[PDB]
Design a protein around this ligand. Structure first.
Ligand SMILES: Nc1ccn([C@H]2C[C@H](O)[C@@H](COP(=O)(O)OP(=O)(O)OP(=O)(O)O)O2)c(=O)n1
Ligand SMILES: [Ca+2]
Ligand code: NA
Ligand code: NA
Length: 318
DNA sequence: CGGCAGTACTG
DNA sequence: CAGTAC
DNA sequence: GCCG
């Protein structure tokens, strides 16, 4: 493996990310992930400059670690970065909020609890700071999925409930659970949140609400009994016609999703959680021209329409 | 030069 | 709207 | 940061 250039680069990428330089961190993340899974430990520059996701600047960076075992840029990391990471790991606080709290003199979560002004969402995030940093065993995700299914199938036994994300990709542990709900009849999915969430609330299962939209719920749940932790839970209701694209999107991974949107763009197509469709119309779309929705009854058709072989969820774990 | 996704909340 | 998240 |  490459673990003597990546380890240095990953410290720079984190500092860029927590300081809000989202695009530079992207390029670092890609270039790093390239190094991770390369067959060979890289030897020198051409080898580098001739790599996908490694350009002149990164190439220069790559030889320093090769030539010197050190990269000078690592000596100019702001002392703020660890605190910014601490603050942005609060659900609901991002880089802008973290930088403002830092500028205001806050340095610890005790400072935040006692003096910061917090949104409803950030207060819930703070209250579950440790829990939301933990992963749950996939068997607990199954229990959470079944709790949603049981509550849903009580109002309409036709409803289909599927846990996506890292659960559907087969991982041993899961950061949170994303439950997708549809109905093959095409309509009965509409307006089920009021009853479903009221039902899950009457349990004591749902403990906090983060986002209560018309098709999307983001909140916090806890199963009964001792030794249970609070978990992040999303519930997304989609029409049956979008089910394939929604399953793909919410199964991820997020890096797999990014690669698929890029591949779709090469074919003049758009890929979202709602549809695979023909482009609107320079770059980043056009002003007029809605585009056509391509028929995607199953996940397999999205791959096919992109000219790609079907990948089971476990093989999307990029 | 400029995209690297578009949309959904929240306030 | 800006910020955050998916 | 990467890329076209
Ligand atoms: N920035 C993001 C965030 C999410 N997603 C999609 C793909 C993810 O798989 C899915 C669910 O979001 P999560 O953050 O829960 O993704 P995972 O379940 O894969 O995260 P984890 O590895 O912790 O399990 O939404 C995306 O495309 N882009
Ligand atoms: Ca998840
Ligand atoms: Na956060
Ligand atoms: Na999630």
């Amino acid at each position: 493996h490459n673990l003597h250039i990546t380890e240095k680069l990953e410290v720079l990428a984190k500092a860029y990310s927590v300081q809000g330089d989202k695009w530079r961190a992207l390029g670092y993340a890609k270039a790093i992930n390239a190094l991770k899974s390369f067959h060979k430990p890289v030897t020198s520059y051409q080898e580098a400059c001739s790599i996908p996701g490694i350009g002149k600047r990164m190439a220069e960076k790559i030889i320093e670690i090769l030539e010197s075992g050190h990269l000078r840029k690592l000596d100019h990391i702001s002392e703020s970065v660890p605190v910014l990471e601490l603050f942005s790991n609060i659900w609901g606080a991002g880089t802008k909020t973290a930088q403002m709290w830092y500028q205001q003199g806050f340095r610890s979560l005790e400072d935040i609890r006692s003096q910061a002004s917090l949104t409803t969402q950030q207060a819930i995030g703070l209250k579950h700071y440790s829990d939301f940093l933990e992963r749950m065993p996939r068997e607990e995700a199954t229990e959470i999925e079944q709790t949603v299914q049981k509550a849903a199938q009580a109002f309409n036994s036709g409803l289909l409930c599927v846990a996506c994300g890292s659960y559907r990709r087969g991982k041993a542990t899961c950061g949170d659970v994303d439950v997708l709900i549809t109905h093959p009849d095409g309509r009965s999915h509409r307006g089920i949140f009021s009853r479903l969430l009221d039902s899950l609330r009457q349990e004591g299962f749902l403990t906090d609400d983060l986002v209560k939209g018309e098709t999307k719920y983001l909140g916090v749940c806890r199963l009964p009994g001792p030794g249970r932790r609070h978990r992040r839970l999303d519930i997304i209701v989609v029409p049956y016609s979008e089910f394939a694209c929604a399953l793909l999107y919410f199964t991820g991974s997020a890096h797999f999703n990014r690669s698929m949107r890029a591949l779709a763009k090469t074919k003049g197509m758009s890929l979202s959680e709602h549809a695979l469709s023909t482009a609107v119309v320079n770059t980043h779309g056009a002003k007029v021209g809605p585009g056509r929705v391509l028929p995607t009854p199953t996940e397999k058709d999205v791959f096919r329409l992109l000219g790609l072989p079907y990948r089971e969820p476990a093989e999307r774990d990029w």
